XYZ file of C-alpha atoms in Angstrom:
658
model
C 0.039 -0.083 -0.119
C 0.971 3.586 -0.275
C 2.588 5.699 2.488
C 0.392 8.071 4.584
C 3.397 10.235 5.163
C 6.687 10.398 3.134
C 9.557 13.009 3.512
C 13.373 13.040 2.838
C 16.543 15.071 2.642
C 16.413 15.843 6.557
C 19.712 17.152 7.804
C 19.918 16.257 11.656
C 22.376 18.891 13.030
C 21.575 18.808 16.863
C 18.322 20.401 16.055
C 15.074 18.751 15.873
C 12.624 18.882 12.963
C 9.013 19.130 13.754
C 6.903 17.090 11.345
C 3.753 17.101 13.619
C 1.607 19.049 11.136
C 2.628 16.696 8.139
C 2.151 13.373 10.140
C -0.033 13.372 13.436
C -3.520 13.658 11.761
C -2.633 10.879 9.109
C -1.866 8.198 11.907
C -4.848 5.841 12.279
C -5.493 2.274 13.570
C -3.303 0.163 15.731
C -0.641 -1.244 13.419
C 2.021 0.768 11.735
C 5.351 0.442 9.807
C 8.222 3.079 9.701
C 10.710 2.918 6.768
C 13.834 5.117 7.401
C 16.919 5.537 5.145
C 19.397 7.309 7.151
C 23.080 8.059 7.578
C 25.030 8.900 10.822
C 28.942 8.738 10.604
C 29.434 11.061 13.461
C 26.585 10.100 15.911
C 26.239 11.355 19.475
C 26.233 8.836 22.271
C 22.626 8.363 22.530
C 20.380 9.921 19.885
C 16.687 9.713 18.597
C 16.161 9.372 14.893
C 12.340 9.584 15.171
C 9.936 10.521 18.011
C 6.270 10.682 18.685
C 5.658 12.201 22.135
C 3.441 13.913 24.483
C 5.113 17.176 24.945
C 3.251 18.619 27.830
C 4.332 19.201 31.404
C 3.716 16.057 33.499
C 3.962 13.643 30.658
C 7.645 13.184 30.176
C 7.459 9.565 29.927
C 4.846 9.359 27.190
C 6.618 8.762 23.818
C 7.658 6.374 21.135
C 11.106 6.666 19.771
C 13.497 5.153 17.405
C 16.930 5.519 18.858
C 20.643 4.588 18.122
C 23.847 4.762 20.277
C 27.387 5.357 18.975
C 28.081 1.849 19.649
C 25.860 0.940 16.646
C 23.049 -0.279 18.714
C 19.510 0.373 17.537
C 16.124 0.433 19.481
C 12.872 1.785 20.385
C 11.141 2.919 23.206
C 7.259 2.595 23.580
C 6.149 4.395 26.920
C 2.749 5.321 28.342
C 2.864 6.354 32.106
C -0.884 6.220 32.510
C -1.058 2.643 31.119
C 2.121 1.577 33.212
C 3.949 0.548 30.080
C 7.695 1.172 29.380
C 8.948 -0.916 26.628
C 12.490 -0.743 25.561
C 13.700 -2.988 22.802
C 17.015 -2.964 21.009
C 19.992 -4.771 19.621
C 23.653 -3.986 19.621
C 25.771 -3.578 16.725
C 22.972 -3.161 14.122
C 24.344 -0.414 12.122
C 26.826 0.820 9.458
C 28.626 4.187 9.705
C 31.013 4.559 7.038
C 32.471 2.571 4.220
C 35.335 3.536 1.784
C 35.306 7.346 3.066
C 31.572 7.780 2.773
C 28.581 7.609 5.073
C 26.647 4.583 4.937
C 22.708 4.643 4.035
C 21.029 2.452 6.579
C 17.703 0.943 5.717
C 15.543 0.716 8.852
C 12.203 -0.996 8.891
C 10.125 -0.983 12.173
C 6.958 -2.884 12.157
C 4.335 -2.231 15.036
C 1.782 -5.304 14.501
C -1.407 -5.067 16.819
C -2.717 -8.300 15.507
C 0.211 -10.437 16.553
C 1.181 -8.043 19.410
C 4.825 -7.826 17.923
C 7.210 -5.258 17.522
C 9.989 -6.176 14.781
C 12.986 -4.167 13.667
C 15.110 -4.889 10.554
C 18.116 -3.057 9.623
C 19.828 -3.311 6.226
C 17.790 -6.396 5.386
C 18.531 -8.152 8.597
C 16.079 -8.900 11.504
C 17.634 -7.543 14.714
C 14.775 -8.039 17.069
C 11.142 -9.322 17.245
C 9.418 -9.092 20.516
C 6.026 -10.167 21.479
C 4.019 -8.546 24.315
C 1.009 -9.475 26.331
C -0.274 -5.837 26.492
C 0.110 -4.226 23.049
C 0.794 -0.368 22.889
C -0.098 1.156 19.421
C 2.617 3.820 18.879
C -0.380 6.227 18.098
C -2.055 5.185 21.494
C 0.266 6.886 23.774
C -1.866 9.309 26.008
C -1.872 12.793 24.746
C 0.717 12.513 21.892
C 1.027 16.003 20.447
C 4.513 15.888 18.618
C 6.166 14.120 15.728
C 9.873 14.881 15.620
C 13.057 13.924 13.703
C 16.380 13.842 15.354
C 14.962 14.369 18.945
C 12.309 13.381 21.258
C 10.218 16.596 22.361
C 9.568 15.990 26.250
C 8.162 18.822 28.248
C 8.911 21.176 25.590
C 12.674 20.359 25.509
C 14.660 18.563 22.933
C 15.948 15.321 24.384
C 18.488 12.763 22.671
C 19.463 15.497 19.921
C 20.808 13.567 16.870
C 23.867 14.232 14.535
C 23.048 12.430 10.998
C 20.685 12.751 8.237
C 17.325 10.978 7.109
C 17.390 10.738 3.328
C 13.785 9.261 3.300
C 11.192 8.350 5.865
C 7.964 6.660 5.091
C 5.047 5.752 7.432
C 2.316 3.228 6.711
C -0.923 2.562 8.623
C -0.368 -1.277 8.261
C 1.958 -3.935 9.723
C 3.809 -4.757 6.503
C 4.478 -8.650 5.827
C 7.866 -10.304 6.136
C 7.465 -10.827 2.230
C 6.780 -7.017 1.751
C 9.959 -6.241 3.893
C 12.154 -8.371 1.574
C 11.109 -6.196 -1.436
C 12.424 -2.948 0.183
C 15.585 -1.758 -1.816
C 18.722 -1.772 0.183
C 22.269 0.036 -0.102
C 24.358 -2.387 1.911
C 28.028 -1.879 1.802
C 28.375 -5.656 2.887
C 27.350 -9.186 1.830
C 26.542 -12.278 3.867
C 28.275 -15.682 3.185
C 26.925 -17.349 6.146
C 23.499 -16.205 7.560
C 20.524 -17.293 9.815
C 18.338 -19.796 8.006
C 20.763 -21.033 5.414
C 21.679 -24.757 5.106
C 23.745 -24.894 8.318
C 20.499 -24.031 10.316
C 22.971 -22.333 12.779
C 21.403 -18.946 14.006
C 24.877 -17.915 14.924
C 28.304 -17.734 13.499
C 31.867 -16.892 14.671
C 35.579 -17.247 13.581
C 35.593 -16.455 9.791
C 38.346 -17.483 7.570
C 39.173 -16.725 3.775
C 41.668 -18.321 1.488
C 42.183 -17.634 -2.202
C 42.769 -21.122 -4.152
C 44.918 -21.342 -7.099
C 41.874 -22.055 -9.432
C 40.700 -18.465 -8.652
C 37.905 -19.963 -6.207
C 37.841 -18.152 -2.843
C 36.907 -20.394 0.025
C 35.579 -19.406 3.449
C 35.026 -21.471 6.790
C 33.557 -20.558 9.805
C 32.133 -21.828 13.207
C 28.439 -22.405 12.696
C 27.353 -22.004 16.400
C 23.859 -23.359 17.416
C 23.751 -22.574 21.080
C 24.121 -18.938 20.959
C 27.601 -17.484 20.119
C 29.297 -19.193 23.165
C 32.594 -20.825 22.718
C 32.717 -24.720 23.245
C 31.175 -26.442 25.379
C 28.113 -25.990 22.835
C 26.962 -27.415 19.526
C 29.130 -25.963 16.911
C 30.006 -27.254 13.331
C 32.376 -26.072 10.868
C 30.854 -24.949 7.605
C 32.419 -23.811 4.430
C 31.255 -21.701 1.320
C 33.029 -20.687 -1.696
C 32.947 -17.749 -4.578
C 33.862 -18.336 -8.137
C 33.342 -14.561 -9.060
C 35.738 -12.599 -6.932
C 33.628 -12.704 -3.916
C 30.424 -11.304 -5.637
C 28.265 -14.427 -4.748
C 28.972 -17.347 -2.440
C 27.669 -21.037 -2.591
C 25.100 -22.416 -0.241
C 27.231 -23.695 2.806
C 28.191 -27.234 3.486
C 29.719 -28.812 6.481
C 33.625 -29.436 6.636
C 33.221 -31.120 10.154
C 29.943 -32.017 11.931
C 28.739 -34.004 14.749
C 25.142 -35.502 14.965
C 24.567 -36.167 18.585
C 22.552 -33.081 18.778
C 20.005 -31.613 16.177
C 21.068 -28.681 13.908
C 18.400 -26.352 15.381
C 17.967 -22.676 14.413
C 17.257 -21.343 17.943
C 16.852 -17.806 19.310
C 19.177 -17.608 22.347
C 17.912 -15.574 25.231
C 19.786 -12.328 25.534
C 18.385 -11.308 28.934
C 20.855 -11.281 32.198
C 19.312 -14.339 33.886
C 19.425 -16.572 30.740
C 22.123 -15.574 28.360
C 24.667 -17.700 29.874
C 22.746 -20.808 29.204
C 25.014 -23.069 27.268
C 24.445 -26.582 25.507
C 26.156 -28.762 27.869
C 25.944 -32.281 26.449
C 27.026 -31.797 22.833
C 30.210 -32.556 21.177
C 31.697 -29.713 18.876
C 34.400 -28.295 16.643
C 35.770 -24.780 17.022
C 38.492 -22.431 15.497
C 39.117 -23.745 11.749
C 41.973 -22.965 9.493
C 42.645 -23.557 5.925
C 45.434 -23.933 3.359
C 45.939 -25.148 0.037
C 48.760 -27.832 -1.044
C 50.220 -26.911 -4.306
C 51.766 -30.269 -5.129
C 48.527 -32.497 -4.463
C 45.966 -29.695 -5.202
C 44.351 -30.662 -2.090
C 42.664 -28.193 0.268
C 43.245 -28.935 3.844
C 41.010 -27.915 6.911
C 42.093 -28.256 10.549
C 39.946 -27.308 13.482
C 39.781 -28.018 17.378
C 37.573 -30.950 18.291
C 35.708 -30.981 21.599
C 34.007 -34.206 23.208
C 30.520 -34.094 24.664
C 30.201 -31.268 27.007
C 33.746 -30.100 26.938
C 35.534 -26.815 26.237
C 38.575 -24.974 27.054
C 37.509 -24.216 30.507
C 36.839 -27.963 31.544
C 39.178 -29.695 29.118
C 41.580 -32.118 30.992
C 44.824 -30.234 30.904
C 47.119 -33.139 31.922
C 46.111 -35.827 29.127
C 46.536 -35.922 25.450
C 43.744 -38.486 25.286
C 46.354 -40.921 23.818
C 48.617 -43.653 24.994
C 52.043 -44.084 23.726
C 53.298 -47.623 23.178
C 56.558 -48.009 21.181
C 56.688 -44.581 19.940
C 53.216 -44.886 18.526
C 50.090 -43.166 19.584
C 46.766 -44.757 20.167
C 43.468 -43.092 21.044
C 42.420 -44.117 24.549
C 38.782 -45.032 25.318
C 36.601 -45.420 28.719
C 33.826 -47.876 28.748
C 30.562 -47.174 30.531
C 30.757 -48.490 34.138
C 34.489 -48.149 34.282
C 36.182 -45.351 36.100
C 39.310 -45.433 34.177
C 40.358 -45.556 30.588
C 41.108 -49.416 29.931
C 40.865 -49.484 26.115
C 42.765 -48.087 23.266
C 41.937 -47.978 19.469
C 44.611 -50.026 17.804
C 45.418 -50.988 14.060
C 42.333 -51.162 11.856
C 39.910 -49.464 14.362
C 40.000 -52.768 16.801
C 39.172 -51.659 20.399
C 41.759 -53.251 22.569
C 41.445 -53.859 26.325
C 44.711 -52.765 27.828
C 44.097 -54.337 31.114
C 43.780 -58.105 29.713
C 45.711 -57.113 26.606
C 42.896 -58.751 24.494
C 41.148 -57.393 21.419
C 37.253 -56.931 22.028
C 34.411 -57.515 19.742
C 34.249 -53.651 19.186
C 35.668 -51.718 16.278
C 35.952 -47.911 15.515
C 35.240 -46.942 11.861
C 36.820 -44.075 10.071
C 33.941 -41.880 11.222
C 34.929 -42.566 14.871
C 31.851 -44.430 15.038
C 31.399 -47.941 17.404
C 30.778 -51.236 15.698
C 30.212 -54.366 17.566
C 30.736 -57.441 15.742
C 30.756 -55.378 12.497
C 27.379 -53.879 13.307
C 26.748 -50.162 13.801
C 25.762 -49.109 17.265
C 23.300 -46.143 17.429
C 22.612 -43.394 20.126
C 19.311 -41.370 20.391
C 19.844 -37.692 19.211
C 19.344 -34.727 21.520
C 17.379 -31.408 20.834
C 17.207 -28.343 22.908
C 14.555 -25.853 23.825
C 13.546 -23.112 26.306
C 9.954 -24.178 26.445
C 10.049 -24.374 30.316
C 11.688 -21.244 31.014
C 15.196 -22.758 31.147
C 17.516 -24.713 28.607
C 16.427 -28.306 28.220
C 18.480 -30.770 26.368
C 16.491 -34.009 25.676
C 16.082 -37.124 23.529
C 14.262 -36.514 20.366
C 13.426 -40.070 19.144
C 16.092 -40.184 16.255
C 18.832 -42.577 16.146
C 22.303 -41.747 15.029
C 25.463 -43.704 14.706
C 27.245 -44.172 17.887
C 30.272 -41.867 18.016
C 33.203 -41.856 20.477
C 32.981 -38.202 20.902
C 29.359 -38.383 22.180
C 27.776 -38.204 25.723
C 25.679 -41.379 25.235
C 28.441 -43.589 23.559
C 29.407 -46.983 25.109
C 33.069 -45.969 24.668
C 34.290 -42.497 25.140
C 37.342 -40.428 24.422
C 39.240 -38.524 26.915
C 37.484 -35.293 27.748
C 40.154 -32.879 26.387
C 40.734 -30.897 23.465
C 41.975 -32.432 20.152
C 42.971 -31.151 16.550
C 41.540 -32.831 13.385
C 42.121 -32.408 9.793
C 39.895 -32.919 6.880
C 40.712 -32.419 3.145
C 38.910 -31.663 -0.015
C 39.860 -32.764 -3.468
C 37.441 -30.535 -5.247
C 38.263 -27.200 -3.716
C 35.442 -27.099 -1.170
C 32.663 -29.052 -2.971
C 32.905 -31.642 -0.615
C 34.996 -32.691 2.492
C 36.516 -36.170 3.767
C 35.892 -37.532 6.968
C 38.092 -35.931 9.633
C 40.920 -37.434 11.383
C 42.680 -36.524 14.506
C 46.171 -35.273 14.471
C 48.668 -37.110 16.945
C 49.761 -35.387 19.914
C 52.750 -33.205 19.754
C 53.777 -32.292 23.355
C 53.626 -35.837 24.918
C 51.381 -38.195 26.474
C 50.391 -35.995 29.352
C 49.898 -32.609 27.654
C 46.428 -31.639 26.249
C 46.645 -30.715 22.670
C 47.389 -27.337 21.422
C 44.716 -24.804 20.154
C 44.409 -24.227 16.298
C 45.051 -20.492 15.296
C 41.901 -19.754 13.227
C 42.302 -18.394 9.708
C 44.861 -19.438 7.243
C 47.674 -21.995 7.295
C 50.838 -21.073 5.344
C 51.872 -22.697 1.999
C 55.483 -21.863 1.547
C 56.113 -20.371 -2.059
C 59.153 -22.135 -2.784
C 58.950 -25.479 -1.479
C 56.071 -28.058 -0.471
C 56.249 -27.014 3.206
C 52.554 -26.405 4.918
C 52.491 -24.829 8.287
C 49.569 -24.228 10.708
C 50.067 -22.138 13.692
C 48.795 -23.368 17.252
C 49.265 -22.249 20.602
C 49.456 -23.546 24.072
C 50.886 -22.357 27.358
C 54.194 -20.510 26.974
C 54.549 -21.238 23.284
C 53.531 -21.054 19.738
C 53.582 -24.537 18.392
C 53.845 -24.681 14.651
C 52.754 -27.788 12.836
C 54.681 -28.646 9.797
C 54.081 -30.963 6.895
C 56.120 -31.530 3.748
C 54.131 -34.230 2.499
C 50.570 -32.786 1.533
C 49.386 -33.193 5.344
C 50.106 -36.837 5.613
C 52.679 -36.405 8.391
C 53.363 -33.611 10.845
C 56.045 -32.424 13.243
C 56.133 -29.637 15.622
C 58.421 -26.699 15.893
C 58.099 -24.704 19.177
C 58.707 -21.149 19.739
C 58.529 -19.919 23.310
C 56.633 -16.516 23.910
C 56.708 -14.743 27.254
C 53.169 -14.991 28.205
C 51.642 -17.683 30.285
C 48.042 -18.426 29.538
C 47.780 -16.298 26.511
C 45.318 -16.966 23.735
C 47.985 -16.404 21.450
C 46.222 -16.728 18.091
C 48.989 -16.304 15.480
C 48.860 -15.695 11.601
C 51.695 -15.982 9.228
C 53.279 -14.120 6.130
C 56.065 -15.355 4.006
C 57.994 -12.025 3.680
C 60.348 -13.654 1.022
C 61.259 -17.171 0.258
C 62.020 -18.998 3.574
C 61.356 -15.847 5.722
C 58.212 -16.151 7.652
C 56.791 -13.336 10.099
C 54.112 -14.485 12.641
C 51.924 -11.872 13.976
C 49.903 -12.787 17.165
C 47.500 -11.853 19.988
C 48.925 -11.333 23.390
C 48.130 -10.309 26.964
C 49.884 -6.952 26.600
C 47.568 -4.741 24.672
C 50.055 -4.890 21.749
C 50.114 -7.316 18.781
C 53.401 -9.325 18.832
C 55.596 -10.766 16.110
C 58.201 -13.314 15.630
C 60.372 -14.240 12.586
C 61.772 -17.346 11.030
C 64.483 -17.571 8.451
C 64.629 -21.197 7.791
C 61.128 -21.997 6.833
C 59.783 -22.350 10.273
C 62.440 -24.589 11.657
C 63.678 -22.048 14.108
C 62.240 -18.751 15.569
C 63.421 -15.403 16.869
C 62.494 -13.624 20.075
C 59.194 -11.786 20.483
C 58.882 -8.109 19.340
C 55.937 -5.762 19.485
C 53.942 -3.577 16.893
C 53.814 0.043 17.837
C 50.997 2.113 16.416
C 48.272 -0.520 17.036
C 46.244 -0.883 20.259
C 44.475 -3.958 21.428
C 42.609 -4.695 24.662
C 44.548 -6.422 27.490
C 42.687 -9.744 26.652
C 43.350 -9.214 22.950
C 41.751 -10.211 19.643
C 42.722 -12.381 16.715
C 44.584 -10.679 13.845
C 44.844 -11.747 10.317
C 47.589 -11.036 8.065
C 48.440 -11.708 4.348
C 51.438 -10.832 2.042
C 50.220 -8.761 -0.890
C 51.224 -9.736 -4.388
C 51.625 -6.273 -5.692
C 54.124 -3.562 -4.887
C 52.843 -0.527 -3.135
C 54.866 2.721 -3.125
C 57.500 0.703 -4.939
C 57.712 -1.666 -1.844
C 56.612 -5.349 -0.669
C 53.512 -5.095 1.462
C 51.819 -6.832 4.282
C 48.184 -6.173 5.327
C 47.117 -6.679 8.867
C 43.415 -6.885 9.945
C 42.511 -6.120 13.702
C 40.541 -3.812 15.975
C 42.661 -0.814 16.877
C 41.309 0.019 20.280
C 42.542 -0.164 24.090
C 39.088 -0.294 25.101
C 36.962 -3.004 23.361
C 36.564 -4.889 20.147
C 35.996 -2.036 17.942
C 37.625 0.527 15.442
C 38.517 -2.246 12.892
C 41.405 -1.294 10.689
C 43.205 -2.755 7.654
C 46.833 -1.381 8.206
C 49.319 -1.735 5.369
C 52.967 -2.138 6.169
C 55.746 -1.740 3.652
C 58.774 -4.030 3.978
C 62.228 -2.649 4.009
C 64.512 -4.939 2.020
C 67.611 -4.268 4.119
C 66.433 -5.790 7.456
C 62.802 -6.988 6.754
C 61.570 -4.256 9.086
C 57.986 -3.171 8.366
C 56.703 0.549 8.067
C 53.206 0.496 8.863
C 52.227 3.420 6.631
C 48.557 3.405 5.880
C 45.561 2.555 8.234
C 42.303 2.164 6.864
C 39.034 2.473 9.181
C 36.662 -0.326 8.253
C 33.874 1.657 10.135
C 33.510 4.081 12.966
C 36.101 3.855 15.944
C 33.177 3.002 18.268
C 31.436 0.286 15.956
C 32.323 -3.286 16.560
C 35.100 -5.318 14.905
C 36.357 -8.547 16.231
C 37.847 -11.583 14.711
C 38.472 -11.328 11.014
C 39.602 -13.075 7.834
C 41.518 -11.288 4.820
C 42.414 -12.387 1.648
C 43.854 -11.034 -1.609
C 41.147 -11.926 -4.318
C 42.287 -13.045 -7.971
C 41.628 -9.586 -9.200
C 43.837 -7.917 -6.503
C 40.932 -6.627 -4.531
C 41.062 -7.575 -0.726
C 38.098 -9.370 0.685
C 37.206 -9.102 4.312
C 35.125 -11.356 6.279
C 34.855 -10.216 9.968
C 32.746 -10.134 13.190
C 30.969 -6.787 12.993
C 30.430 -6.568 16.669
C 32.179 -6.826 20.090
C 32.522 -10.709 20.400
C 34.090 -10.105 23.913
C 31.236 -7.990 25.454
C 28.677 -9.601 27.740
C 26.231 -7.323 26.241
C 26.452 -8.278 22.596
C 26.072 -12.113 22.978
C 23.830 -13.957 20.530
C 23.347 -11.635 17.613
C 22.645 -12.919 14.292
C 24.150 -11.924 10.901
C 26.883 -9.736 12.245
C 29.802 -11.762 10.509
C 29.866 -9.725 7.259
C 31.862 -9.769 3.976
C 33.107 -6.625 2.092
C 35.357 -6.022 -0.789
C 38.181 -3.305 -1.014
C 40.801 -2.230 -3.304
C 44.172 -0.843 -2.559
C 43.404 2.624 -3.476
C 40.620 2.601 -0.725
C 43.189 1.541 1.869
C 45.968 4.095 0.974
């Protein structure tokens, strides 16, 4: 239908614009839709874009507003003191500020639906909240409304929440427009989604993006598909992948690289309230933190990720056990049978389950999918599903049988509850993935596994060497393969931090010379250098000119193929903030050929200093553009948990950065 009111080109310069005479007499009925196209690249801390209020003395709390914060949060207030109603609905990290030196036109759609008693907000084609209430308050039914305002709310005759920005277009409808109609509204998005709520993964949340450009020109991406909100393991998380054959313009429907089936793939809206937001799926196995590399010789794509048994995460993982038993310089996966209090079994040659106590083979075997067979017959367990129907998180059997896996809660034979690393490969550049296999332990029988550094592995340009960085307490542990990932050895590099999440990414500065950039506990990104293809490593130095928080954030890094200002270039991606995960930047460093030192010469701001930017992936696209897939929110903040569609993709050119 046609709008009851439509206006545009409104400049909000800390001075409200009164549109009462244009709009108030046109409002009718209990349902309304507001469509607003707006810019704000220099917002005040808290500002109202649109207001309907009772501006009379004594009615200060009778108003409707659409507001935003300089954090990028968007929301509404719907308040009527006589009715005793004070609704506040909002979501952090819903907005764009600037892209390539230009203010971004955000397209906001707010639907106030009396029939279903629901208020729904979309921004840039993404639903950011949908709130159903017992007692509906139509925005036009607030007692004594006498003002309609842009760029403030008029309360007791004064301008509150003054805004800096512009409203290019605003439209109001006396109808709650349908989900279908919303989808038809044109958008001006600076970003794309590769993974998103409702896609083939059926995860409502995603974290830990990766990107890697393959030799064919295909660009591949992996990610954590996180089902139980955005929580780290313990949870249900799978690793998903998608690729682009057109320089990032379009992306394939995701598939899984690594997945477990003990719990259903459920699209769930995770509670964001203070009582329930820490609810965590507690009985599911999961994968977490993937990394990809391409092997030139075999042409294989290799993907590693951490593997967590049912109910296990970093916090509760057995720190003094690898999960393997060494027997004659060979490692065997240990198993515990239900009823036993110790691990009396190992998985020997050909998947045979062997009793270590009696030194006899059993009638059980483990297949290549880590599934349990008895006398050759596949055992099953019942799958779990999760719900909040009862007011709290419940995990319960759903009637479906799935193969019994040694990583599952219900399995007859269980692995040691600690963290592992697994590897899978693809022989068709991400169209399908093989069954994963566990890597061996690298730091001995009685040390838990190291943690994979998410992002890219490194394929040395002048040899067949492949390297994946990992970390543990007190060191980076580089995993090195010269045979297409068939066998691995470690190279340890001590770092002067205990208990750091030392996520590290590598660039080959020149043949045989690797620089590794990594997260620390000091507020500065660190680096170390190898001049022998990763055999040995320098002491740790720090990058001046970029700030991180004390807890740090993953940093991505590539070696750019083209000269910049006549020099070899490295590009880093990281938040640049001592305060939070925000102020995302790409930082261009020029290498000095004399001493391999790097002049960090250009800093490109991804969006506002105050807008969220966390884990990130960068790659040089085949056309020499840069693709960036990143968490556009503060993935540390306890206020920004469980947001959907915030991992986003953009395309940049070197000219944009410099």
